[PDB]
Design a protein around this nucleic acid. Structure first.
Ligand SMILES: [Zn+2]
Lengths: 53, 102, 97, 116, 95, 83, 97, 83, 109, 95
DNA sequence: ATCTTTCCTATTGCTTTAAAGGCAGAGGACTGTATTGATCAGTCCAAACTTCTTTCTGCATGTACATGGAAAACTGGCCAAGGCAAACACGTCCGGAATGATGGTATTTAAGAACAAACATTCCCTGGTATCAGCAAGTACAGTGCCCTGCTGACAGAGCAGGAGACACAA
DNA sequence: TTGTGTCTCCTGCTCTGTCAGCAGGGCACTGTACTTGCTGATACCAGGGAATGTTTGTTCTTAAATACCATCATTCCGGACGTGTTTGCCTTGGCCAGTTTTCCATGTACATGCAGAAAGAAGTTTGGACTGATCAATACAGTCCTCTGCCTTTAAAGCAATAGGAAAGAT
């Protein structure tokens, strides 16, 4: 699954929007709090920088 | 209906032999006898117990399990290869020199 | 008849439950009273930080859990499933306590 | 003019503080003198060890479908790794719990009779 | 005023962001990591002090730290930690 | 004010829970008194050192660091209390 | 008929003999060969002081004697008198090795 | 020069004597290989640390003090060889 | 002129060396500074412990009809005393042996 | 001559003569006693240094030694050693 | 309970080896003074502990039932102990030689100390995203009863081989 | 005309049919407990701004580690002889492991009430900051004497031999 709004494939708690499609936790909370979708610019991301055996 | 001349041992042996894979279980033997002998539709408990006793007692039949558990609820009994032919030449009723492992 | 699990089933269920969780298993207030009672023999009118009592309880529960693990091994060694005083005594002897 | 300052941690390519480690070595009465490379080596080793533990703990957190590492995840990471378990064998982690482990002989058996 | 309390929290957080960019850590876990870093520091430093004392050396050098790491850490941890320390010292010296 | 018989506050269900976390299935009826004695000895040993550390500092409050040092010197190193 | 002591008599005699004495019970030369063999894997062409090898032998024999004491306790806990590898394994497990 | 299978130099009589000093009366036949394995593990653990101490001093001879320090690092303090 | 020198051991009434103990404290990197009474206290404690062990070991040597204390007698003294055995629990005595101890179950009928 | 190597042998012998006037001691036993004295010294001094560090003090005083003795020695040994140390310090303070 | 065998302890004489005692010197303890930095003593305050009161339950205590695990008794076979004999590998010592450790000198590199600038780290304060709580479906698994399928002790009954009586062939 | 082989009919052994009982094991049903998914509440961690104390840079000094050489001690290798220990084998005894039985002492579940948990509030009390004061440790130089290395003497311990007592095993 992926978020209907911002399309993150991993989230701590999947939620559902008014249309019933799945949304990730951050987008769902942002919608329920502010009445506006969560910006993809507001979404964060990162890539691993260290590794070992 | 009249009782068939065949004995239970001969009937079981013929049922095992006539199978497509030379394999049958007790339930399939029961189905086969139900199909081709209307005589045994009465005395069901009697002939069931007789078949079970004969199958358990006669050494020419040996049991085999089901590898991936199959439909289950039973086991597969195969004719012992060393038995050869015992009811050959019209001797279906009473055999001579009953097969024995020892 | 009403339902009734056989002996050991609920015991295994409780083993799984309490190995899955992390919360402290002794009641806080009676343990605090025990700590104060023991401390009063060494010095009178002592005061305790809350974190000090929490550290004591954490260490004590960890120690007892480890001791019960070793006791269980000793009981299993003797072809038993019931832990007995002799098992704790053997475990504490081998541990050098 | 005086050259612009540059931290020794950045100079060594580390995230851990070389200056703080050097100060702690000097203040701890470990030796009369401390070499220039000793704090660098020590900071690098500490950084490596914490990186190892954090990687394993993050994997453990992901297995539990969590996003924040908690003491339980550190306990699971340490006790499931043979080398970290050896290093931290005598250590108690507050609110860490124990590994799930039941002796095989304690599990129930199958009886021949199926009646009560 | 009131005395400030230094800790390794920010550095542990930076290392965490390096290894798991999307993962966080709770305050209790951070306290445990602080305890861990202090414990390992004390072990290595004490062993290095012992090594210097045995050889009648006044100074703890990177060689003492390397030997202490070999003594304390088990197995592959010792090898990887020695590699990391040597790499850090070489980078520091070249710069 | 005076505390007298609080060792019995370590109840039977508490000891059962501790044993269950240790993987114990069946518990003899005599285990509970043994566990109380062992816990008493362990607590006495730890609290003696903790109060010694407190007295050396001339404090009247037992701090978490006193407990941490007392445990550490007994080979019972504890993380998560400001060590 | 030739004389024979019943089983276990000479065993108790040897227990008394070797608990009364203090000399090393392993032969020195093969133990030294074992020490050198193990050491060659860590570094080649290692010299050894004689006192180093003697310290190693003292430590090893003390460790093994203590382990056998714990093993004997574990065996007696199982209502046996013969020590078995399971006893050594349990003793090592509880000691934390 | 090279030595191959010296672990078997710890003969069955030697292990029996060690068990007797430990108070053991009856010994299973499989005890001897178990004891050889345990002894080899212990010796490897001690000798690794002793050789590490030797190498750090830039020496090529393992001294009794190296062994004493290696044992003390493992909680097995030995008297009679120090100094 | 300087007064006649007196060892600090004589002032404290001890047999152990206060001066050497103070020097070892200073050289051991234990602390920045060392108090005047710290070496006296430490030397007194060390002398007391030495006297305790030597008393017990001399008794053990006497029990063996021996005149000289050997490692066996030190082992016997340490392991037969609860306090010393607790203090020296993790210590190995070279050539000390062990206490004679056979479990009761192993004895014959 | 070889390089001097100090030890506690003469003081252990003097204490022995004080306690058992007619008893001797072998060289191996004297080595064991020397190791014992070094071990106990290191224990007490290390504990005292840790005590001073915990309290942010620079000097190890007789109070640090007393607390270390209380922490390390068990039971009756602790109180007897404390009495002996206090008596020695009282004698010394009177010069 | 008594007799034989083996082992252990105890006693006496010689010796040898390890400890006790005596002497030289050097390095480390001691004495005395000035410096200084660590610690002590008194005050204050705020924050962290202790104490008391109220609700509210969730958890502990006590009870009854019955299940199954621990302990006792028995058996046997097989694994370990005890003892004999031959071999072999340790223990002791002795010598040659190669190596490595210690000590001393010239020197070269690196760390401590001091002072100033500035910059990284701590504390404090705000939002927003993870985590917790509650409810309800769904799944997993325990406990129990029913049925099929196996095996065995027991009896009774048709099939067919073998022995007895009658006919036909050989003597 | 009389005795024996072959044909016919009756009887006994073979083997199969039929009862009956107790065991293993598969599968269906009921019920309890845990997990998963969703929404809503909350709490706790991430991110942004002020200050302070700690790190970095530069210079000089000095002392700690380095390189070379010499030499001596100390470890490695080989060899030889004596003999105590190890290894292999045989005999058998008693200890470990498996099986059976009993009963008692644990586990499970229900019901009651009580004290532990949480919140609030007040009291209080003490841990730490701040200032001045004082006192105890460091540093340095010079004196001298205690401890360690070397060497010599003797007595405590070791070894050998003998004799007597204790204990084990068999009758
Ligand atoms: Zn989204």
């Amino acid at each position: 699954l992926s978020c209907a709004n911002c399309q993150t494939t991993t989230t701590t708690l999947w939620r559902r929007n008014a249309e019933g499609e799945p949304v990730c936790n951050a987008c769902g909370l942002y919608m329920k709090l502010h009445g506006v979708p969560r910006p993809l610019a507001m979404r964060k991301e990162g890539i691993q920088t260290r590794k070992r055996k | 209906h009249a009782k068939p001349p065949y004995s239970y041992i001969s009937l079981i042996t013929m049922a095992i032999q006539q199978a497509p894979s030379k394999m049958l279980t007790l339930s399939e033997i029961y189905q086969w006898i139900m199909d081709l002998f209307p005589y045994y539709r009465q005395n069901q408990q009697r002939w069931q117990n007789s078949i079970r006793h004969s199958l358990s007692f006669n050494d020419c039949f040996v049991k085999v399990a089901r590898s991936p558990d199959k439909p289950g609820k039973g086991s597969y009994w195969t004719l012992h290869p060393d038995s050869g032919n015992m009811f050959e030449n019209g001797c279906y009723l009473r055999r001579q020199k009953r097969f024995k492992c020892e | 008849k009403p339902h009734r699990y056989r002996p050991g089933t609920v015991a295994l269920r409780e083993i799984r439950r309490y190995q899955k969780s992390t919360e402290l298993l002794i009641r806080k207030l009676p343990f605090q009273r025990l700590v104060r009672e023991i401390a009063q023999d060494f010095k009178t009118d002592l005061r305790f930080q809350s974190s000090a009592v929490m550290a004591l309880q954490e260490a004590c529960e960890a120690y007892l859990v480890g001791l019960f693990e070793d006791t269980n091994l000793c009981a299993i060694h003797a072809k038993r499933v019931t832990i007995m005083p002799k098992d704790i005594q053997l475990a504490r002897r081998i541990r050098g306590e | 003019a005086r050259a612009k300052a540059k931290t020794r941690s950045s100079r060594a390519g580390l995230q851990f503080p070389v200056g703080r480690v050097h100060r702690l070595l000097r203040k701890g009465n470990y030796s009369e003198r401390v070499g220039a490379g000793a704090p660098v080596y020590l900071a690098a080793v500490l950084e490596y060890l914490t990186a190892e533990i954090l990687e394993l703990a993050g994997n453990a957190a992901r297995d539990n479908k969590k996003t924040r590492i908690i003491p339980r995840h550190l306990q699971l990471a340490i006790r499931n790794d043979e080398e970290l378990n050896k290093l931290l064998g005598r250590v108690t982690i507050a609110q860490g719990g124990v590994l799930p482990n039941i002796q095989a002989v304690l599990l129930p058996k199958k009886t021949e009779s199926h009646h009560k | 005023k009131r005395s400030r309390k230094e800790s390794y929290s920010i550095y542990v957080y930076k290392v965490l962001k390096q290894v798991h960019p999307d993962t966080g850590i709770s305050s209790k876990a951070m306290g445990i990591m602080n305890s861990f870093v202090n414990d390992i520091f004390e072990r290595i430093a004490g062993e290095a002090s012992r090594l210097a004392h045995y050889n009648k050396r006044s100074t703890i050098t990177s060689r003492e730290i390397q030997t202490a790491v070999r003594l304390l850490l088990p197995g592959e941890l010792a090898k990887h930690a020695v590699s990391e320390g040597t790499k850090a010292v070489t980078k520091y010296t070249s710069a | 004010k005076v505390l007298r018989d609080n060792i019995q506050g370590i109840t039977k269900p508490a000891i059962r829970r501790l044993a269950r976390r240790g993987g114990v299935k069946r518990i003899s009826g005599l285990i509970y008194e043994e566990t109380r004695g062992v816990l008493k000895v362990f607590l006495e040993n730890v609290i003696r050192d903790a109060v010694t550390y407190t007295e050396h500092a001339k404090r009247k409050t037992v701090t978490a660091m006193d407990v941490v040092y007392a445990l550490k010197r007994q080979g019972r190193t504890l993380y998560g209390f400001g060590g």
